[model samples]
Target: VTKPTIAAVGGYAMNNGTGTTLYTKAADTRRSTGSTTKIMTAKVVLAQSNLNLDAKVTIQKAYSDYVVANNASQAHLIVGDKVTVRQLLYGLMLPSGCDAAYALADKYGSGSTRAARVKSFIGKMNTAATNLGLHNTHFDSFDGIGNGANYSTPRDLTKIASSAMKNSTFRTVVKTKAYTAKTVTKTGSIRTMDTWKNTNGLLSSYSGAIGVKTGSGPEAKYCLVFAATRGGKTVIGTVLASTSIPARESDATKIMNYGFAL
Candidate 1:
C-alpha cells in the first residue's frame, strides 16, 4: 500500500558488507525529500575536519526567525544559549528542527555572512552527495525546506543513510527515542530543553528497527529511510510519498521483513 519501495543489503552496507540483497519499484526515481535532507546535513557536519561533537554553538535570532518564517519544527533552543554540536544533532534529527539545522550550517559552513555560510553549507551537502556518486540527489537548503530544487531518489537516499549510519555517533543519535539538552543560558544559568521525540515511529513500533529518518512536505508527502537488525543481520531501505504516517511505517515494515527473509 505504498507508492514505491526499495531495499538494499549492501549498497553502502552497514552490516555484513556484500552485494545487493533485495529491492523494489521506482528505486532510482527522484522525488522531493523533505527532512530526509537533514540526513546529509548531519553527515556533512560529521565529516568536517577535526570535528568536535562537543563544540558549543550560540543560538542566533536567525535560527528562530527561520523557524518562524517557515513554520518549521523546532528544538526550542533559546537564543544566546550556548548549545553543543552534539545537542544540535539531536535537535535536528529528533524534532526535525529547521532551527537546529540552521545552527549547524552557520557553525560549520565557511563564510563571513550568514547567507554565505548557509549557501556554503548547501554546497557542502551537494559535494557530499557528489562524493557519494549520487547523481540524482541535490540539496538546496541546509534543512529540507528546499526552495524548489531539493530532491533525491529512494536508492540514492538509502545509500546516503547507510553511509551516514556508519558513524557510531549518528547511529546512536538516530536510534535514540528521546533526548533532553540542558543549555547554558545567556544569563549563564542552565535551561533544560523540552525532550525531543524522534519522528521515526518505527523506533517505538518496530522491534529491531534502529533508525534513519522521516520526511514530509507539500510535495514529499510521507517518506522514510529505515534500518533494522536482527540475528546479526541488518536491512536498510526507503519508502517515498507513502499515504500516511502509519502507512509509511507499515511500508518500511514490509520491506524490512522482505530483506531479512532474502
Candidate 2:
C-alpha cells in the first residue's frame, strides 16, 4: 500500500525564542476585525517608492460619515484640518483612527476624484488578500469600521500577516508599543499629540512577543494574531472568536505557550 503523498509542503517549527504556530480553531468564522484592516492599508502606502510622510492632506466632510455614524477611534481630525502621511500612520495605528485610513486612501488610492481613489484602493487591498491565497477572507472598508462584509479566518489571516511582515515599514508599525507626533501647520504647531501606545498587551507581558496585529468587535468577538521572538527565533499564530476580552488574550497566550513548549 502506498502512503498518502503530500504535495507542496510548507515549513513549521519551534525555536527557543521563535517559530511556533498553534491554533485553537481554523475555519469560516466571522468576527469584527477592528483596526487589523489598517495592516493592509499600510501595505498599500509603503509599496510606493517615494512616499512623502510629511505631505499634508486635509480631512474632508466626506470623512464625517465615519466620524458621526460608527463612533470610531480618532486623533482629533477636523473636516478642514490637515496632517502628514507619517502623522496619519500614527493616528491610524496608535489610536486606531478610522479618519486616518480615509486620509491615507484618499491621498494614494487612485484618480483625482475622492470616490475613484478610495474605490480603487479597496480593490488593491482585495488584490493583496487574493494574491496571498486567502480564500475565506474579504474586507469591506479602509478602517475596518462595521463592514457587513469584512471577514477572515485565523488560517487565512496568518497569510495576511505573513505577507505584510516581509515589509520593514509594516513590521515597524505593529511592534511599536508607543509613538508621538505633532500637528503641523502655518500657525506654528498649536497642538501636539504624544504618548501613543500599542494596544497589544502581550508585548509587555509576553517576553518574546515580536510584532503583528490585534482585532475585535461585537460580532467579531475578540480576534487576534501575534508574532513573538524567543531564543533567537520567531513564531506566529492567531486566536479567533473568543468569548470575552480576557478569554481572547488567554486563548492567544495558550497558543503561544504551546508553541514555546514544543
Candidate 3:
C-alpha cells in the first residue's frame, strides 16, 4: 500500500459506499473547524420534514452587520432583499456566507424572539451531532464563527458530510462552481446579484472532485471536506488545520487519490 504524505494536522478518508477507512491522521483529534461546520448547518436545515425550499426570507440588517463586524465571509446579501431558501444554501456553501447561515438559522429555528430562535438552532445542531453518534462534535453558533465553544473531529466531520450528501439537493449544490441569486427588492422589484464563486478549488483542479466545503479562521487555519466519484467508486474525507487554501485542497487531493487507488 502506498500512503500519501499529508500536511494537514488532522484528517480521515473513507470509501463512501463501504465506509472503509482509507487513511487516518490524528482522525479523532479535536480541532476548531471553520465553515466546514456549515455542513451540519445545512444538514440540519435540509432535514426538516416539511421544508419549503422556495420560501422567501426577508434579509435583515443584522445578518449583514454580523459579517461586517466579524470581518467574516459573506454572500453579499443586501438588507431588505427577499431571497429564497434554496438560493441561500448556494450562498452559504459556495461563498461560505455567514449572513446566509444567519438567515437560515433565524428562519428555521422556532421561538418568538430572533435571539431565542438562533439559540434554539444551535441546540438542534448539537442534537443532530449526538444522534449521528459523534462524541467529539459540538456547536455553539449557527455559523462557524463560534462564541468560543465549537469543535469537531476529522472523523466526526467526515461522517457528517457523507450523510448530508445523501440528500439530492445537497449533492446538486455542492458541486456547482458558481451561482447567481436573484432577490426581490423591498419595493418588490427583481434584483439580479453578482455571481458567487466557489472557494473549493478541488472542483476545478481534480477530475472527479464533487465537494464538501472550505473553511478557515485564525484558529481553524484552513480546513476542507472533499468527495469525488470515478466510475462506480466514491470517496469522502476531511482535513483540519492545514496551511492555506491551496494547501488544504492539496492535502484533500492526496488522500482522495490514494482512496481511489485502494
Candidate 4:
C-alpha cells in the first residue's frame, strides 16, 4: 500500500539515530507546539556543563504562581520544597509540568531577575536548535505555555527528540509510566510526593512503544512525538496538529507501523 493517510496536518517518520526518513507530509511547516516544548527544555538541562542531576533546587512561589496564572499543567511541586534536579526532570516530562519547567529554567538560567533568567533559558533552547542545524524550530517559553511564539516542524521536532534520547537519563525519564519523587520540605524532612504518571498514552496502547512526548492546545491541537523499538530497530517520529489525543496516537501508530514495515 501507499503511505497511509493520517490525521495530523504535519507528520514525519524516521529511523532513530540514522537519519533514514520513512514518511513525510508537510513535515517542515512550523506550528504551535504546546508542551512538546518541554522536550527541548529537558534537552537543554541535560546538556548543561558538569551537570549535577542530584543537586537540590528550592521550589519557589513563582513556579507555582506561573502555572496557576496560566492554568497550565503541573507536577504539583510545593513552594519551599527542595527537589532534586533529577526529580524535576521526571515531573517536567511526566505531567508536562509547567511548574517543573519553571523551576529548571530558574535554576539553570543566568541573570539577576527571574524574568531575565527565563529569557536567558529560552535563548539556550534556541541555541540548541541552531546547534542541531535546525531552522524551523523556535522557543519563547521553557514549558510550552507560549506567549504566541513557540513553534516547531515535524521533522525538526523529531530530530530534537531523537537527539534528546541520546542522553541515557532522558531516555529513561520519558519511557517511565509513573515516577515518585522524594523531596525535602521546608522543615528539611523527606517528603514522598505523589506519583507523576507519564501523559503519553501511546506507551501502554502501542506494542513496542517507548516514548518521546505529547502536546495540545487551542493552536497546537494535539501533537505527539513518539518512538518505539522493535526487532532491534527503533522508529521515531512526530505528528503535529491532529484533532484529538487519541487521533494523535492513532496517527503515530499507523506511521510507526509503516516505518517498521519498511
What are the lDDT scores of the predictions, listed in order? Answer: 0.84, 0.68, 0.92, 0.92
True lDDT of residue 262, candidate 4: 81
Q: What lDDT tens digits, residue by residue, belong to model 4 across residues 146-241?
A: 767889899999999999999999999999999998889999899998899998998899988889899987788899999999998999999999
Tens digit of lDDT per residue, candidate 1, span 132-210?
9889998888888876699888888888888898899999999999898989999899998888999999998888989
TM-score of each: 0.93, 0.83, 0.98, 0.98
Candidate 1 to truth, TM: 0.93
Off by over 4 Å in 1: 1-16
lDDT of 2 by residue, 1-262 (tens): 2222111111122332322343334334544566677777887787766698778887787776766677776665656666778778767776677778888888888888998998888888888888877776788788777476887766566666776778776777778888876665445554565566777788788887866666666566565667787775576766665666566666666666666565
lDDT for residue 45 in candidate 2, whole number 0-100 = 82
Local lDDT at 158 for model 2: 66
The lDDT of model 4 is 0.92
In model 4, pairs of residues that clash are none
- Which runs of model 2 end up more than 4 angstroms from their true locations? 1-21, 27-32, 78-80, 186-190
Q: Whole-model lDDT for model 2 versus the true structure?
A: 0.68
Residue 126, model 3: Cα distance from true site in angstroms: 0.5
Best by TM-score: 3
Clashing pairs in 1: none
